[PDB]
User: Fold L-Ala-D/L-Glu epimerase, a muconate lactonizing enzyme from Klebsiella pneumoniae subsp. pneumoniae MGH 78578.
Amino acid sequence: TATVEQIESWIVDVPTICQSLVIVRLTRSDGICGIGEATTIGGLSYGVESPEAISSAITHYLTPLLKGQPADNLNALTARMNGAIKGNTFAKSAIETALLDAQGKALGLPVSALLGGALQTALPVLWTLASGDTAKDIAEGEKLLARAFKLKIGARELATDLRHTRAIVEALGDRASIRVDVNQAWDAATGAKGCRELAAMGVDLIEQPVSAHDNAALVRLSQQIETAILADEAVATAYDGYQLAQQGFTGAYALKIAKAGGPNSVLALARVAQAAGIGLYGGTMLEGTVGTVASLHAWSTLPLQWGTEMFGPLLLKDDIVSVPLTFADGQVALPQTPGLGVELDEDKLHFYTRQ
Amino acid sequence: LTATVEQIESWIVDVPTICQSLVIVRLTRSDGICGIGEATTIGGLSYGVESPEAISSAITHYLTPLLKGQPADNLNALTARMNGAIKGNTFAKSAIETALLDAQGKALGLPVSALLGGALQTALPVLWTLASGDTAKDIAEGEKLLARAFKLKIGARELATDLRHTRAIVEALGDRASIRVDVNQAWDAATGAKGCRELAAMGVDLIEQPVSAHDNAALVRLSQQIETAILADEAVATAYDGYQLAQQGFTGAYALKIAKAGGPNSVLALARVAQAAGIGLYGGTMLEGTVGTVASLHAWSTLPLQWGTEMFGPLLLKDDIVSVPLTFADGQVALPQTPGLGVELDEDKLHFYTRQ
Amino acid sequence: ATVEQIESWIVDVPTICQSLVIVRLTRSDGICGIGEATTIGGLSYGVESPEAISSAITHYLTPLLKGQPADNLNALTARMNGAIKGNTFAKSAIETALLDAQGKALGLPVSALLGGALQTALPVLWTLASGDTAKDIAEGEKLLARAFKLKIGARELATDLRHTRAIVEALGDRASIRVDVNQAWDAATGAKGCRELAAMGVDLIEQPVSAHDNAALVRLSQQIETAILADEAVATAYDGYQLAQQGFTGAYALKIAKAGGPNSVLALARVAQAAGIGLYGGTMLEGTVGTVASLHAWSTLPLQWGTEMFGPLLLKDDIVSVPLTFADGQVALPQTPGLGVELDEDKLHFYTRQ
Amino acid sequence: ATVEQIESWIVDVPTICQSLVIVRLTRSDGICGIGEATTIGGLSYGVESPEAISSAITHYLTPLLKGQPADNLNALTARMNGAIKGNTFAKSAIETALLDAQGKALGLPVSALLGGALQTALPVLWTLASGDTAKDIAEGEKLLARAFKLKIGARELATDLRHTRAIVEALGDRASIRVDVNQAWDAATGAKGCRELAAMGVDLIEQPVSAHDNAALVRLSQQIETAILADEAVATAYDGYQLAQQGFTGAYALKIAKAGGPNSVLALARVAQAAGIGLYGGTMLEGTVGTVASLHAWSTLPLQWGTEMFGPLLLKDDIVSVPLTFADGQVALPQTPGLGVELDEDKLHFYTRQ
Ligand SMILES: [Mg+2]
Ligand SMILES: [Mg+2]
Ligand SMILES: [Mg+2]
Ligand SMILES: [Mg+2]
Assistant:
């Protein structure tokens, strides 16, 4: 017993080493509260959901729809949310995260336990190399080697992006796992040539080389390229995961709570992938501490062949939590106290709130 | 909140029917909390590859030494350990998973349905099966209930006879009743095509596993050409089977059963695969007593089941090994919402009905 | 003549322990036949354990078969499959015993009952799996002084590949090198691993991915540049047809335990032949009884990939009076009535578990 | 025991003439077996004529087999197929004689050599093909005094459909009505004709289109609302697998002549079973020898569609000492050593061609 009596949200702009986060605080009738985060990148340049539209969905639609409803019935709450609201998975993710945080506090259990239990309490976290200068990247990756790196490419001519990558592989490749992310930039022709070259040089994983508008090409590449392919934008929900797998895609999926609608909702996609023999990867939308740890609790319950990229907090100069997660030796420690394991620093929350 | 499994006990129990052999398990944690579970089948080895004695064997010789000493609150870790060391034996795994969930539910003061994300419904529909082998007897029985869904078992007689049998029941329990049939793998491809066409034509709403699980190809073809819904049973046990069949083009519904998947939580993966693929859901049974039946109901409660459930197993027994049975009424069963499964073991009965 | 009685024992024998389920079937005409159903590591490699196999025989197959005509294998098989789902290991032991007894009754070796042996000497490879590359190479070198099967999949991919590469370079010149991943690899690892294996010259890759992913197995068979051997992916003739129809190309690891016996496995073999799929005489590491039973069946077929019937060579002792003669990478097939081996009652009772 | 001699005669027996190719194989141990290879209409229905069948036996199979061990069917079969392409009719006769002889040597009926009979009495339907509806109905009514096969395809579609329709009306309530188009319909006629046949209650439609169009046969089996029986489209286990993999659903008309003998045909049967294809005991209108040889094989299998082994009933005389017993829509399978039939020397010499 206990219902959701209040839902608050704020658009927070925190300084980066500005990132806009949509923070939510949900209060249950039993006095317990929970927090959640929905963050994206580049306004509307990378996703259809912007911070202001995410805020809007929570305030005008999710709040009145959920207030008064039993707060512990995740399945019933999710059915209601999906039945009354199409898409808007980022907004839903923030809400679902807050619900789990509050429920965990009410039971004295970490979200991971609510999700069936953690397979591990320390998760691997890779580092992305994208300084714009090959020399810097190699240097930065070199200090960390003193074990997995993600290179962002697709913004330059193919020849230059390949030279850049090859340089990094030859310098770091024998001691680290090299992955690249083209984030939809390549057309089918460039994709085929680029992927063949990336595979030939030793790249371990190629992320979303073609547009999500061309899953047919993605499938073809996964069946012809001699290295692993990681689907990102091509797969958001369990429905997408089944569809792409059925179509013949082979490789891995970049799981993201924001694309699926939450720490719990993303698990359906995970199990569908597993059933189809698709590998798993813990993805991010560059969330701050709240959204990152929320994702981590879910990732902890699954075997993640490809690791995770939950380094979002490490890109911020400041966050809205009182205590940040602890990162060390290419890993992040998963809190195991009640709920998410982090708390809202109200002073910082107000300081960074947009308006 | 946390504890390790200290002991695991199991008994083969033979209970009288209106005997059905149940494999009951009691798992004891280091905090003193106990959880119970049930693994039951039909007709020894005639319907499945796991018999009551082999199930008992799997629990005693393999699952027990594998799980004792392990944290009992971490179902994901325990499941990975179980599947990593034990191939198949989903019936045995289901009894253990059920007990683990029962115990952690009691530990959190929550019903299993809540541990599974929450119940969408706390009262579930339960149809009745007509399988007396006599058309007249079946109609009478069904007539009594109509004073709403019936599952007719066929496939034991010549096609013409089974079709006349079903047609008679359809005419009699006409308007106010959903008629489903279960051939349980009995038909060859040719007989199945003819039989299924006739069944669809007479108004049957669902045809369960018309052909052999050795011929999923035929099952898929039938689901694409037959003018009524097809329900897969033996053709789908785990989420892996579920994905494969759907990818192959099967359209219709899946008969979810905790025994086939490995428990109340494990079966949920199959359910999600089905949902992602547009395949309907049905709450199936292996004719479990009260323990296995309620374990299944807790899982079924968290899902939208278009085809309802067939959890009438307890109603076929003259006695069970629980202190208090579930309450059935008006084509439904009430789902307990107390901590754990909501049912308690009656030790006096347990010992009385134990085989040895 | 009818089946009058069926006895079974779980026997734990010492290795260089292996648990065998031995069966003795008694016909109404005084003739007895023996059979064996053995697996590896309890329930770690298959769904049928020694105790579950014993249970199937004692509680279900015995009461089902007692009183039935013992010479009608077709009728007996139909009855068994009609009343018993799966449990192919138990059935294999029973079918073996029926054939052994039948052969004795007719004064013919089991191979003759199965239509006649094409050869009486079968090739037997050796498996290198000490976990140590240097040891494996040494051991294989001692034999070349010519087919080896390497077990991998228990370590990081790079390690297993380096391990296999070292063995191929040292023994590859004069020996067929095959590997067995026994379902260990996920799809991505499988693609990379298989390509690397093919590139280094491995002749056959056995069950690289999980039986839960026949789609991956099919894909790999169509793209990898070396032969793929299906094991767990194919047990019965039904599986054999399905996988072939799906597009799998390569070979099948025939095992009497997976199919239900020396005769039952022949149906899978014919389905494979019809589909252009190669054959391999597989084992579950059976003792002398189950090994010779498999051998009689294998003798009747063209086995492109040979056999791995070296199970008895891993035992310090067995429950038979006289073992099979292994020599020069081959094993001699007995041609006396029945299986050609007899149960040593003292050892049987000595090694019986209960 | 080796094959010492092989004799063969082209025999022309009177009908109610049919040309049979009879074989007698003598083993070094004095035991002999007989076989039969028969066809219909010279070369109008198959590629193997009685004279070509005789030639294959005399000029090729005989020198190939003489001197070889007579009890190893597998070895003999590999030798025969390795040296001779096709010519399954000739091989069937030789294989039958080998089994007959082996059975006598072991004191077992051929069915037992094939693993055991599931039944010793098999259903036999009657073919109505007088070309006249009235005559067909009369003959059918006389037999009902359980299953009929109507031959059609030689006339206009509307003519054949009205014909079958009349027969279904007259005999349909007391018997299973099947039709055989024997490859006569083009694809368009087949679609229209098969839909009409299904709608009027026909239980099985045999080979409606040409074997040159398996694609059409597959399409029809997937859209027609009644069972389809493949005949010319499937002869060997290879054909059986290919057609099944292509998507064909229905049944196969097994024939020892098409596969190469009572044993050889079993591989096709197992492939069909593995793929979920039903079985039917087919005939080329063999006399008693060829017919009983088929029956022994059919007895070991579950035949959902029965058999059409009525060949002997069309003859005024045969070359056997004692004919099979047909009664109550069935035929009795002899269970004495070998085939269970003996060659009648006088009748044999009397009917030998030249
Ligand atoms: Mg992306
Ligand atoms: Mg069933
Ligand atoms: Mg294996
Ligand atoms: Mg024909």
In short: The radius of gyration of chain B is 20 Å. Residues 1-109+341-354 of chain B form a domain with the Enolase-like; domain 1 fold (CATH 3.30.390.10). Chain B touches chain A through 32 residues (CB under 8 Å). The pocket of magnesium ion (ligand 4) is lined by residues D 182, 207, 231-232 (CB under 6 Å).
